[PDB]
């Protein structure tokens, strides 16, 4: 575990993270995809061997000794708000199990279902609260990666509010 487990947020490419493992915002078919998924494919392509996994689950594949945790959030274009919410919470609970099993002291994590799987809605608060619900009982240092300057502010405020 980390000596004083923390949450932090950085506005940069998750492919350049300084953590002991990475969470991919994966698709269910283990395809290169778009956005975070395509950055992860370019950096750790070996990690996409047998990475396909259902919605609401996480599957870890090693790139050398570096773990890539493929976490499949729901596409809110296809799911109802209710079922999508259930699967998004489930994907993060599976991430917490994997982080724990791996014994890492730190993990880089994107906000699942906030990009092309958002169904054109702002899901910052919904996705971040499910992240907190899952990761709060873990002792890894969590570093959240985002792209948008206003999202960085909001995520930073949400972290600092609970401290
Ligand atoms: C979540 N972060 C990303 O997907 C990013 C990808 N690139 C190329 C970036 C450049 C500046 C800041 C963030 C990103
Ligand atoms: Cl960057
Ligand atoms: Cl997404
Ligand atoms: Cl963002």
Domain residues of the chain, as ranges? 1-163
- In a 3-state reduction of DSSP, which class is residue 33? coil
Residue identifier of the C-alpha nearest atom 5 of ligand 1: 13
Q: How was this structure determined?
A: X-ray
Say how many Å lie between the CA of residue 147 and the centre of ligand 1: 5
Resolution given for this structure, in angstroms:
1.4
17 is in an annotated binding site: no
Q: Where are the beta strands (DSSP E) in 18-94?
A: 22-25, 58-63, 66-71
Joined tokens for residue 130: 């499910």
- Burial class of residue 115 (count of CB atoms within 10 Å of its CB; 0-12, 13-18, 19+): middle
27 is in an annotated binding site: yes
Q: Is 13 in the pocket of ligand 1 (CB under 6 A)?
A: yes
33 is in an annotated binding site: no
Tell me if 130 sits within 8 A of 84, measured CB to CB: no
């Amino acid at each position: 575990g980390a000596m004083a487990p923390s949450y932090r947020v950085k506005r940069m490419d998750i492919a350049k993270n300084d953590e002991e493992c990475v969470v991919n915002a994966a698709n269910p078919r283990g395809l290169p995809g778009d956005g975070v998924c395509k950055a992860v494919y370019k950096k750790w392509p070996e990690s996409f061997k047998n990475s396909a996994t259902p919605v609401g689950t996480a599957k870890t594949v090693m790139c050398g000794t570096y773990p890539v945790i493929h976490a499949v959030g729901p596409n809110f274009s296809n799911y109802t708000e209710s079922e999508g919410d259930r699967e998004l919470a489930a994907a993060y609970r599976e991430v917490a199990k994997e982080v724990t099993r791996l014994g890492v002291n730190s993990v880089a994590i994107p906000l699942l279902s906030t990009g092309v799987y958002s169904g054109g809605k702002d899901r910052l608060t919904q996705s971040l609260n499910h992240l907190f619900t899952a990761m709060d009982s873990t002792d890894a240092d969590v570093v959240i990666y985002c792209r948008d300057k206003e999202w960085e502010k909001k995520i930073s405020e949400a972290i600092q509010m609970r401290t």
